[PDB]
Amino acid sequence: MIHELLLALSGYPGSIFTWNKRTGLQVSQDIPFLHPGETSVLNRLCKLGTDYIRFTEFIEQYTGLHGIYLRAFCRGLDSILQPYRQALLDLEQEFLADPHLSISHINYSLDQFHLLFPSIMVVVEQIKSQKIHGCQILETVYKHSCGGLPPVRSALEKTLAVCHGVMYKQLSAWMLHGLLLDQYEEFFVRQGSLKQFSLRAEMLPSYIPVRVAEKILFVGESVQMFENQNVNMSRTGSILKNQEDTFAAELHRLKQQPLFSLVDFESVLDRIRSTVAEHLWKLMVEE
Amino acid sequence: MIHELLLALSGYPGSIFTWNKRTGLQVSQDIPFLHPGETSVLNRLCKLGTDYIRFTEFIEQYTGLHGIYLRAFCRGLDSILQPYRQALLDLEQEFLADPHLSISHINYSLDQFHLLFPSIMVVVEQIKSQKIHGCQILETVYKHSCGGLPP
Amino acid sequence: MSAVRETMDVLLEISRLLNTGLDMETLSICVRLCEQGINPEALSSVIKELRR
Amino acid sequence: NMSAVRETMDVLLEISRLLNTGLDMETLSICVRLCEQGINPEALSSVIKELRRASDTLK
Amino acid sequence: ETSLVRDLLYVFQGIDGKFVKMCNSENCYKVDGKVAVSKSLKDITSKLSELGWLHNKIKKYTDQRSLDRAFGLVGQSFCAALHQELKEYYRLLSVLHSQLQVESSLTLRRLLVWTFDPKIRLKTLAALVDHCQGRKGGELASAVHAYTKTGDPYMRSLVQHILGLVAYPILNFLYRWIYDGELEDTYHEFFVASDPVVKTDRLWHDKYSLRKSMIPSFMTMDQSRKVLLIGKSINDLENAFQTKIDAAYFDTSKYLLDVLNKN
Amino acid sequence: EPYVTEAGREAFDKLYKLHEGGLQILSATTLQPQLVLLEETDLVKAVLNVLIGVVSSTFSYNQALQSFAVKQGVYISGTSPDNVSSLLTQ
Amino acid sequence: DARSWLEQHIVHQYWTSRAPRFSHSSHLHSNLSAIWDQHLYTTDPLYTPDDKTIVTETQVIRETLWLLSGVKKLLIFQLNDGKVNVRNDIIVTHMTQNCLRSVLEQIAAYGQVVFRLQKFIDE
Amino acid sequence: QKSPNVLLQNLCCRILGKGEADVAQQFQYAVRVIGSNFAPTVERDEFLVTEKIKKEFVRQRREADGALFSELHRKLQSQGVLKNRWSILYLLLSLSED
Amino acid sequence: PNVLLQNLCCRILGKGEADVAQQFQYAVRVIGSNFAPTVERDEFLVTEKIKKEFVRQRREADGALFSELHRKLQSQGVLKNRWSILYLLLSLS
């Protein structure tokens, strides 16, 4: 029973392990040559392999709404299962050392995962039953770590950090020469001279205030209007300023956070709204 | 097996690496103890010994149709065999070092010569079938080098 | 032979935890005395003196 | 599982009866088990005819 | 016999034996049907049944740990602390069965000393879930505050593990509000509820109150009123809490002296 | 795990003897061909000897053609049997 | 005799049946298939014991190595050069037949692409 | 259990109408016959066997019953417990009677 | 017996023979007059003493760990007379 349970937990079904395909919860058989007690505990170690294959199905589905934060969150989500798949293979050598280990040892070891996996089932569920996309994936994950439990709080700020990196590329390209990346139109900066730009209040976090959003808007609109006109007048320069390299380095420094720093995100919204802002100010003075 | 295969690919037949003048140098079908899978990759290595003896006859036939750019074309053909024969020799010193080897290692090292050799074999057959000689030899190789494949 | 090596590894682990300060050589000797039906009480006393 | 094997038997049993047989349900079950376990169909057919014949001479 | 020595193992994980039962919420007593001359060695294994009953009250608590997001922030942090000690309880079941498969027979009285060290631990976790029926935060802080004044040194160690993780969301609320003036609520499990009427520009005005009926008992009543004044002005490990709010009070008053400079 | 490839050259030599054996029956006159020693070292000393007008054991001077002649029958060439036999002719 | 020498210094054949056969190891959880088969044969009244090609435990990962980049595989059936699949007789003794099928079906479909991508190569 | 040996004895016991140990002498004779090889007349194609059974039905003047047989065939195919349907079908075909 | 006990002096003292002689004399005297166990044989009592030792020192994790280690020692099925080995390692903690 031991090697069919190691690999059914990795997402490879047995046929003493029977996969009923995400309806019900009969996921191990009734086994005559183990005890009546031993087939009852087996189903419990299998519900933690059923919610594990509910996660590997959600990656392929959102790796083809179907936004690009849906998909940043999937490649966030595969890194929570990285100590899961690593602890199963660390268990392989434990069962080769002696054949005296049974599935009560497996219970002890695989309950650092029963404090992680139901709680993340609820993250992915509220995702697929509301059809959420955009920056409000980050806002789901943020309100789910608004809950307790120390394993689920360390993990969902790491899943938050990988997809806040997916925001960091948007808002840096937005405040360079005014590039707007939209592959499905997911980011809060909306489009639809100087051109048109507007903000959606319906794809905006609750950890980004309204008053924080508008520091990103006004800077980004200034660089955009020189992308039409002339880029020797560029506030951020390109030829005549290497402030964009300082801005890159600053972004990279902050790209990761141990969990999520709110004060560091908004500190560099100050810096991009000053220093380079002394260039276009001395045009409109004289104009 | 490993080192004895190197001699099949510098054009010297065993009775295991049998030479047929129809389909080429080929491994003999289902000989005792040779994995189904290892005969398949040994046959891809034998196509690089088939076009290699179809190339060394093309030198010796026309050195030592008639032409004097044909034999300049033969010293044109000996220069592409130059890295091949060095890579047979760098397999040779490895298999004298220890005798346990996988044929996946020769598969890995001599695929590089599996995309130079077919693309030059069309060159010498095209020379011999339009019967062309001379200064139009220089024209014949030039417009193929215009063609794809950086190697 | 192999089981005899694995068993000694278990015993070395029993030794590290209790802070005995017995090496791979000192433990193996002790075992051998122990297997011949020597009283551990007597055996412990001798050891303490030998370290003095 | 119990249900499924019964239905498998049930269909075969209907076919045996149409074709007329002297085998009962129990024997028929045994034959299938032999079929699954290998055993070319001609050897089985022959052993049956010889055994059927010997029973008539005896009784 | 050997089959009973194994059977008692399963009842520790709270998994019904290979004999019929009419108990699993009463104790976990097994009736074989020849229990009559097993009335001395069934009676030993009826004392061990009572350990498996106390396992099940902790286990059903953990079914309430995580819902579509269970009520409280502290209610589940408590439940995390209760599952950890269940995890350590499993560790001895996982050596016990691995002895019952070597080249076998382990005596009933030998395994009784093995279940005695969990019997002073799990029983005081099952006593600690009896005082709580609600999950609302600060109730839980009064449970461990009621159990670390009690006698007996052996469960006093166990409740000091639990104090360290129950208390940890209390302190995560506390230190953000003292320094920056920022708060967290998810269900009104902080002892500060917000919006008595409506928000008003700061000058010190009634906006927060002690909200006694969910106060954590870790703080005394004049010290909960102290940290309230600190949090408006910016705008045992139970006894380390009252020390550093006195050191906070001096740093926040420099901030209050900066408000005079604005007017 | 040892395959024919992973076992060695020596394994190939044993097999080569075996593979041969089937064909040797009809090349047989009344008995089949037998193996003849040369070591790996005997070849690398011989290769230098044909190229100076001298015979070694492998090389047989033929004075009715003024050409050299290698042993026409099966010579086992260390662990490289009968491939060297063709290589040693060029 | 040479035949017998080869047979000991090379692992025993499993593309042709004419080599005796292992599927033994001293661990208790590695003879799982012999236990699983036995169960099926007594529970199910109608069990069909397959004719199984005995493999040669954890040499299935060598056929995964070849299959993912390298040559066509004639040890396993490929219906065509864009459809790789795994024969229904491969057993490894420390798993079930079915359980085995399921890991080999993931790599089969991943070797289906590299093998298909190899037919695009025009030398 | 259901080893070949145990199943061949049960078959013999009921068909000969005599006890278990009293059908032995015929039991040995039965093992030689099965262990001597034969090869069916129809060796290839599952369909070649089915059409034969179907032809037989007409011959016996029982056209209706051959229609019923087609319907049963679909039922057998769908349940999939058996992987040598043909052996079972050739065997009843041979033991057909009026 | 005679050799093994001499070996014990030699490795600890890090000296050969004619250096360890007096020490040998103490050891011989003290082992021989009390050769056979003076306690009733029982693996479980010694094990419990080792785990209480862990608890007393508040090394709970290692006390559980130990329990896993004793099963490993027992399982291999090589060394019998196990109590005396264990006993010794406990006295010298």
JSON list of C-alpha atoms in Angstrom, two decimals, chain G residues 3-119:
[
{"chain": "G", "resi": 3, "resn": "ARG", "atom": "CA", "xyz": [25.73, -17.70, -24.56]},
{"chain": "G", "resi": 4, "resn": "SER", "atom": "CA", "xyz": [25.72, -18.29, -20.83]},
{"chain": "G", "resi": 5, "resn": "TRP", "atom": "CA", "xyz": [28.48, -15.76, -20.23]},
{"chain": "G", "resi": 6, "resn": "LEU", "atom": "CA", "xyz": [26.46, -12.93, -21.97]},
{"chain": "G", "resi": 7, "resn": "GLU", "atom": "CA", "xyz": [23.40, -13.81, -20.03]},
{"chain": "G", "resi": 8, "resn": "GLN", "atom": "CA", "xyz": [25.13, -13.12, -16.67]},
{"chain": "G", "resi": 9, "resn": "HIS", "atom": "CA", "xyz": [27.08, -9.99, -17.67]},
{"chain": "G", "resi": 10, "resn": "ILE", "atom": "CA", "xyz": [24.17, -8.34, -19.39]},
{"chain": "G", "resi": 11, "resn": "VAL", "atom": "CA", "xyz": [20.78, -7.85, -17.75]},
{"chain": "G", "resi": 12, "resn": "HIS", "atom": "CA", "xyz": [18.26, -10.56, -18.63]},
{"chain": "G", "resi": 13, "resn": "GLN", "atom": "CA", "xyz": [16.22, -10.05, -21.81]},
{"chain": "G", "resi": 14, "resn": "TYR", "atom": "CA", "xyz": [12.69, -8.54, -21.78]},
{"chain": "G", "resi": 15, "resn": "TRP", "atom": "CA", "xyz": [12.07, -7.89, -25.42]},
{"chain": "G", "resi": 16, "resn": "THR", "atom": "CA", "xyz": [12.18, -11.68, -26.11]},
{"chain": "G", "resi": 17, "resn": "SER", "atom": "CA", "xyz": [11.37, -14.43, -23.61]},
{"chain": "G", "resi": 18, "resn": "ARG", "atom": "CA", "xyz": [14.28, -16.87, -23.39]},
{"chain": "G", "resi": 19, "resn": "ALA", "atom": "CA", "xyz": [15.97, -15.38, -20.24]},
{"chain": "G", "resi": 20, "resn": "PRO", "atom": "CA", "xyz": [14.69, -16.27, -16.65]},
{"chain": "G", "resi": 21, "resn": "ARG", "atom": "CA", "xyz": [13.06, -13.61, -14.68]},
{"chain": "G", "resi": 22, "resn": "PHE", "atom": "CA", "xyz": [13.33, -11.70, -11.44]},
{"chain": "G", "resi": 23, "resn": "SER", "atom": "CA", "xyz": [10.67, -9.67, -9.54]},
{"chain": "G", "resi": 24, "resn": "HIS", "atom": "CA", "xyz": [11.99, -10.39, -6.04]},
{"chain": "G", "resi": 25, "resn": "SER", "atom": "CA", "xyz": [13.39, -8.08, -3.27]},
{"chain": "G", "resi": 26, "resn": "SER", "atom": "CA", "xyz": [13.61, -8.59, 0.49]},
{"chain": "G", "resi": 27, "resn": "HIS", "atom": "CA", "xyz": [11.57, -5.42, 1.45]},
{"chain": "G", "resi": 28, "resn": "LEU", "atom": "CA", "xyz": [7.90, -6.16, 2.31]},
{"chain": "G", "resi": 29, "resn": "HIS", "atom": "CA", "xyz": [6.37, -3.41, 0.17]},
{"chain": "G", "resi": 30, "resn": "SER", "atom": "CA", "xyz": [8.22, -4.32, -3.05]},
{"chain": "G", "resi": 31, "resn": "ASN", "atom": "CA", "xyz": [6.44, -7.55, -3.88]},
{"chain": "G", "resi": 32, "resn": "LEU", "atom": "CA", "xyz": [3.21, -5.46, -3.93]},
{"chain": "G", "resi": 33, "resn": "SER", "atom": "CA", "xyz": [2.07, -6.79, -7.29]},
{"chain": "G", "resi": 34, "resn": "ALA", "atom": "CA", "xyz": [2.17, -10.45, -6.30]},
{"chain": "G", "resi": 35, "resn": "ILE", "atom": "CA", "xyz": [-0.13, -9.42, -3.32]},
{"chain": "G", "resi": 36, "resn": "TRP", "atom": "CA", "xyz": [-2.39, -7.17, -5.45]},
{"chain": "G", "resi": 37, "resn": "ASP", "atom": "CA", "xyz": [-2.84, -10.00, -8.16]},
{"chain": "G", "resi": 38, "resn": "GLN", "atom": "CA", "xyz": [-3.77, -12.50, -5.48]},
{"chain": "G", "resi": 39, "resn": "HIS", "atom": "CA", "xyz": [-6.45, -10.24, -4.09]},
{"chain": "G", "resi": 40, "resn": "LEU", "atom": "CA", "xyz": [-8.05, -9.72, -7.53]},
{"chain": "G", "resi": 41, "resn": "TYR", "atom": "CA", "xyz": [-7.94, -13.43, -8.28]},
{"chain": "G", "resi": 42, "resn": "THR", "atom": "CA", "xyz": [-9.95, -14.34, -5.12]},
{"chain": "G", "resi": 43, "resn": "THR", "atom": "CA", "xyz": [-12.33, -11.31, -4.86]},
{"chain": "G", "resi": 44, "resn": "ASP", "atom": "CA", "xyz": [-13.40, -11.04, -8.43]},
{"chain": "G", "resi": 45, "resn": "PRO", "atom": "CA", "xyz": [-15.06, -14.40, -9.64]},
{"chain": "G", "resi": 46, "resn": "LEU", "atom": "CA", "xyz": [-14.37, -13.16, -13.11]},
{"chain": "G", "resi": 47, "resn": "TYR", "atom": "CA", "xyz": [-10.79, -12.08, -13.10]},
{"chain": "G", "resi": 48, "resn": "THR", "atom": "CA", "xyz": [-8.70, -12.33, -16.34]},
{"chain": "G", "resi": 49, "resn": "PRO", "atom": "CA", "xyz": [-5.05, -12.83, -15.40]},
{"chain": "G", "resi": 50, "resn": "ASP", "atom": "CA", "xyz": [-3.10, -11.09, -18.22]},
{"chain": "G", "resi": 51, "resn": "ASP", "atom": "CA", "xyz": [0.01, -12.47, -19.86]},
{"chain": "G", "resi": 52, "resn": "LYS", "atom": "CA", "xyz": [2.42, -9.84, -18.51]},
{"chain": "G", "resi": 53, "resn": "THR", "atom": "CA", "xyz": [5.86, -8.95, -19.78]},
{"chain": "G", "resi": 54, "resn": "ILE", "atom": "CA", "xyz": [7.85, -9.12, -16.47]},
{"chain": "G", "resi": 55, "resn": "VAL", "atom": "CA", "xyz": [9.97, -5.98, -16.19]},
{"chain": "G", "resi": 56, "resn": "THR", "atom": "CA", "xyz": [12.95, -5.33, -14.74]},
{"chain": "G", "resi": 57, "resn": "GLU", "atom": "CA", "xyz": [12.24, -2.79, -12.09]},
{"chain": "G", "resi": 58, "resn": "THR", "atom": "CA", "xyz": [13.25, 0.81, -12.53]},
{"chain": "G", "resi": 59, "resn": "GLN", "atom": "CA", "xyz": [14.62, 0.30, -16.03]},
{"chain": "G", "resi": 60, "resn": "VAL", "atom": "CA", "xyz": [11.41, 1.95, -17.17]},
{"chain": "G", "resi": 61, "resn": "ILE", "atom": "CA", "xyz": [13.13, 5.21, -16.43]},
{"chain": "G", "resi": 62, "resn": "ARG", "atom": "CA", "xyz": [15.84, 4.24, -19.09]},
{"chain": "G", "resi": 63, "resn": "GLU", "atom": "CA", "xyz": [13.07, 3.88, -21.64]},
{"chain": "G", "resi": 64, "resn": "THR", "atom": "CA", "xyz": [11.73, 7.24, -20.51]},
{"chain": "G", "resi": 65, "resn": "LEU", "atom": "CA", "xyz": [15.31, 8.66, -21.27]},
{"chain": "G", "resi": 66, "resn": "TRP", "atom": "CA", "xyz": [15.50, 7.37, -24.76]},
{"chain": "G", "resi": 67, "resn": "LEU", "atom": "CA", "xyz": [11.85, 8.20, -25.51]},
{"chain": "G", "resi": 68, "resn": "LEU", "atom": "CA", "xyz": [12.05, 11.91, -24.57]},
{"chain": "G", "resi": 69, "resn": "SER", "atom": "CA", "xyz": [14.82, 12.71, -27.15]},
{"chain": "G", "resi": 70, "resn": "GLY", "atom": "CA", "xyz": [16.44, 10.06, -29.31]},
{"chain": "G", "resi": 71, "resn": "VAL", "atom": "CA", "xyz": [15.10, 7.35, -31.43]},
{"chain": "G", "resi": 72, "resn": "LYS", "atom": "CA", "xyz": [11.87, 5.58, -32.08]},
{"chain": "G", "resi": 73, "resn": "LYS", "atom": "CA", "xyz": [11.13, 2.94, -29.55]},
{"chain": "G", "resi": 74, "resn": "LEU", "atom": "CA", "xyz": [10.36, -0.53, -30.81]},
{"chain": "G", "resi": 75, "resn": "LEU", "atom": "CA", "xyz": [10.07, -1.90, -27.31]},
{"chain": "G", "resi": 76, "resn": "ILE", "atom": "CA", "xyz": [6.80, -0.08, -26.94]},
{"chain": "G", "resi": 77, "resn": "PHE", "atom": "CA", "xyz": [4.04, 0.24, -29.48]},
{"chain": "G", "resi": 78, "resn": "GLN", "atom": "CA", "xyz": [3.62, 3.52, -31.25]},
{"chain": "G", "resi": 79, "resn": "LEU", "atom": "CA", "xyz": [0.49, 3.47, -33.46]},
{"chain": "G", "resi": 80, "resn": "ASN", "atom": "CA", "xyz": [2.00, 6.27, -35.51]},
{"chain": "G", "resi": 81, "resn": "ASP", "atom": "CA", "xyz": [4.76, 8.87, -35.26]},
{"chain": "G", "resi": 82, "resn": "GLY", "atom": "CA", "xyz": [2.49, 11.33, -33.46]},
{"chain": "G", "resi": 83, "resn": "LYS", "atom": "CA", "xyz": [0.88, 8.90, -31.05]},
{"chain": "G", "resi": 84, "resn": "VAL", "atom": "CA", "xyz": [3.09, 7.33, -28.37]},
{"chain": "G", "resi": 85, "resn": "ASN", "atom": "CA", "xyz": [1.59, 4.90, -25.91]},
{"chain": "G", "resi": 86, "resn": "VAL", "atom": "CA", "xyz": [2.53, 2.40, -23.58]},
{"chain": "G", "resi": 87, "resn": "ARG", "atom": "CA", "xyz": [1.79, -1.38, -23.83]},
{"chain": "G", "resi": 88, "resn": "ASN", "atom": "CA", "xyz": [-0.76, -2.93, -21.43]},
{"chain": "G", "resi": 89, "resn": "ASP", "atom": "CA", "xyz": [1.48, -5.65, -20.02]},
{"chain": "G", "resi": 90, "resn": "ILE", "atom": "CA", "xyz": [4.25, -3.65, -18.42]},
{"chain": "G", "resi": 91, "resn": "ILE", "atom": "CA", "xyz": [4.39, -4.39, -14.67]},
{"chain": "G", "resi": 92, "resn": "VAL", "atom": "CA", "xyz": [6.96, -3.32, -12.08]},
{"chain": "G", "resi": 93, "resn": "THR", "atom": "CA", "xyz": [6.74, -5.46, -8.97]},
{"chain": "G", "resi": 94, "resn": "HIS", "atom": "CA", "xyz": [6.59, -2.62, -6.39]},
{"chain": "G", "resi": 95, "resn": "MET", "atom": "CA", "xyz": [3.42, -1.11, -7.85]},
{"chain": "G", "resi": 96, "resn": "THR", "atom": "CA", "xyz": [0.19, -2.28, -9.45]},
{"chain": "G", "resi": 97, "resn": "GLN", "atom": "CA", "xyz": [-0.14, -2.68, -13.24]},
{"chain": "G", "resi": 98, "resn": "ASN", "atom": "CA", "xyz": [-2.67, 0.13, -13.33]},
{"chain": "G", "resi": 99, "resn": "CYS", "atom": "CA", "xyz": [-0.69, 2.36, -11.05]},
{"chain": "G", "resi": 100, "resn": "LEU", "atom": "CA", "xyz": [2.33, 1.87, -13.28]},
{"chain": "G", "resi": 101, "resn": "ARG", "atom": "CA", "xyz": [0.36, 2.71, -16.45]},
{"chain": "G", "resi": 102, "resn": "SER", "atom": "CA", "xyz": [-0.33, 6.19, -15.18]},
{"chain": "G", "resi": 103, "resn": "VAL", "atom": "CA", "xyz": [3.29, 7.55, -14.66]},
{"chain": "G", "resi": 104, "resn": "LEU", "atom": "CA", "xyz": [4.33, 6.00, -18.01]},
{"chain": "G", "resi": 105, "resn": "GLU", "atom": "CA", "xyz": [1.34, 7.69, -19.67]},
{"chain": "G", "resi": 106, "resn": "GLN", "atom": "CA", "xyz": [2.57, 11.11, -18.56]},
{"chain": "G", "resi": 107, "resn": "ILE", "atom": "CA", "xyz": [5.98, 10.71, -20.09]},
{"chain": "G", "resi": 108, "resn": "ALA", "atom": "CA", "xyz": [4.52, 8.98, -23.17]},
{"chain": "G", "resi": 109, "resn": "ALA", "atom": "CA", "xyz": [2.52, 12.13, -24.01]},
{"chain": "G", "resi": 110, "resn": "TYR", "atom": "CA", "xyz": [5.60, 14.27, -23.34]},
{"chain": "G", "resi": 111, "resn": "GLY", "atom": "CA", "xyz": [7.77, 12.10, -25.67]},
{"chain": "G", "resi": 112, "resn": "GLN", "atom": "CA", "xyz": [4.79, 12.31, -28.22]},
{"chain": "G", "resi": 113, "resn": "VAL", "atom": "CA", "xyz": [5.80, 16.01, -28.72]},
{"chain": "G", "resi": 114, "resn": "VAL", "atom": "CA", "xyz": [9.60, 15.67, -28.98]},
{"chain": "G", "resi": 115, "resn": "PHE", "atom": "CA", "xyz": [9.18, 12.71, -31.40]},
{"chain": "G", "resi": 116, "resn": "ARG", "atom": "CA", "xyz": [6.67, 14.75, -33.39]},
{"chain": "G", "resi": 117, "resn": "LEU", "atom": "CA", "xyz": [8.93, 17.80, -33.30]},
{"chain": "G", "resi": 118, "resn": "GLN", "atom": "CA", "xyz": [11.78, 15.42, -34.60]},
{"chain": "G", "resi": 119, "resn": "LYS", "atom": "CA", "xyz": [9.75, 14.54, -37.80]}
]
